[PDB]
Amino acid sequence: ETRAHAEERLLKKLFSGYNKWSRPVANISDVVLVRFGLSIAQLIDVDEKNQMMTTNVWVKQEWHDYKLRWDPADYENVTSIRIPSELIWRPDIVLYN
Amino acid sequence: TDTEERLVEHLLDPSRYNKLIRPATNGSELVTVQLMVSLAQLISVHEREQIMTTN
Amino acid sequence: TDTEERLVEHLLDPSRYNKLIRPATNGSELVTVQLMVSLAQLISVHEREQIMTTNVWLTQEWEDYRLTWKPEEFDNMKKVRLPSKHIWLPDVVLYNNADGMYEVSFYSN
Amino acid sequence: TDTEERLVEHLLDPSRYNKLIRPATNGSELVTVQLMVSLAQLISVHEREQIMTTN
Ligand SMILES: *[C@@H]1O[C@H](CO)[C@@H](O)[C@H](O)[C@H]1NC(C)=O
Ligand SMILES: *[C@@H]1O[C@H](CO)[C@@H](O)[C@H](O)[C@H]1NC(C)=O
Ligand SMILES: [Ca+2]
């Protein structure tokens, strides 16, 4: 009945046969839309001599995964969880320059 | 000690304790955390690059 | 997709794929690696300590006979993205580096 | 190869080889290690703090 036990049940169900190396689309032709944003914490340095810019940013990302879905009615009205980001698929967004 | 290691095995048994889960009871109750900072030393204030170092 | 994750599981199944063994058949044949350097920026030349800094994309191509599959058996999939940390890689490094950074920075798929 | 993989899986079989044990037989024999340093480049000699950097 306790929320922790329900969360444990949900975690055990979610990652039963989850593969973090596979793109999370139900159909191969589907595209994963990634909502991308930046949020700058501070402008650390502008090195004019070396032509480099150092910034502290928050890289906000948001996408949909079709396998990580549940009905909150089956898990004590648990509506969202926090899990380590290295257990799931993530987009490989990199800074080019 | 035998009892102490039996207790430590019992508490941290991954079968019944998951460290990725908040210790919340009573449905949607929140976990209260008390914080207190103890300053051991002000190591340096670097005015040039505006950084304070503390232990 | 279910088929994609089935294929990824089948290809990387550690029982039947050892990433520490060269993908050479027929005994002692050699594995040919194609190499191509692409330059993105010449970041700096530091004459004082004699070091050049570059941002390069190092294209590598080879053949791994253990990573084959039949498209008709996997919903007609022609290629897949595998993490490069879980397949065999040729240990190609910048041999004349300075500061001892032999390897690449990112390890993309 | 299948043969190379079989050989590697046979040599390192943890059921009959663990790396925590020195390869010594005959009671108290000692493992002889042959050492040879080959210099790749003398990176720098920093006279100020008396440090030599080598590859
Ligand atoms: C995937 O989408 C294509 C194109 O719309 C369609 O032909 C195919 O039947 C779909 N497959 C599944 C499993 O939904
Ligand atoms: C479930 O919990 C949410 C709070 O996250 C609340 O707004 C909602 O009314 C609850 N529903 C039920 C049926 O308990
Ligand atoms: Ca500056």
| Residues paired with residue A21 on neighbouring β-strands, in sequence order | none
Distance between CA C85 and CA D28 in Å, rounded?
42
Structure tokens at D43: 């990176």
Q: Which of A27, A30, A31 to mutate to test the pocket of ligand 1 (most atoms within 8 A of CB)?
A: A27
Phi, psi of C73 (to 5 degrees): -85, -5
Q: What are the helix (H) ranges across B2-55?
A: 2-12
What is the residue type of A71? D
| Residues paired with residue C34 on neighbouring β-strands, in sequence order | C61
Distances (CA, A) of C42 to A79, C106, D7: 50, 19, 46
Contact predicate C29/D5, CB 8 Å: no
Minimum distance, in Å, between the CA of residue C44 and any CA atom of chain D: 19
Distance between CA A15 and CA A12 in Å, rounded?
6
Number of residues that this document lists for chain C: 109
Contact predicate D11/D17, CB 8 Å: yes
Query: Atom 3 of ligand 2 has which residue's CA nearest to it?
Result: A77
Give SS3 for C102.
coil
Q: b vs e for D23-40, b when ≥16 Cβ sit within 10 Å of the residue's Cβ? A: eeeeeeeeeeeeeeeeee
| Residues paired with residue A55 on neighbouring β-strands, in sequence order | A43
The residue among C78, C79, C34 whose CA lies nearest residue C58 is C34
- Find the CB nearest C24 among D1, D8, D55: D1
What is the residue type of B38? S
Calculate ∠ Cα A63-A68-A71, nearest 5°: 120
DSSP state at residue A94: -
D13 touching C, CB under 8 A? no
Q: Which of A22, A23, A47, A93 to mutate to test the interface with C (most CBs of C within 10 A)?
A: A22
Q: Which atom of ligand 2 is nearest to the CA of A77?
A: 1
Distances (CA, A) of D22 to A11, D3, D8, D29: 44, 28, 20, 10
Structure tokens at B32: 């209260």
Number of residues that this document lists for chain B: 55
Q: Is D1–C20 a contact, with Cβ atoms under 8 angstroms apart?
A: no
Contact predicate C19/C84, CB 8 Å: no
Distance between terminal CA atoms of chain B? 35
**Overall resolution, Å:** 2.6
What is the residue type of B26? N
- Find the CB nearest C8 among A21, A92, A96: A21
**To the nearest 10°, the Cα dihedral for A34, A37, A43, A45?**
30
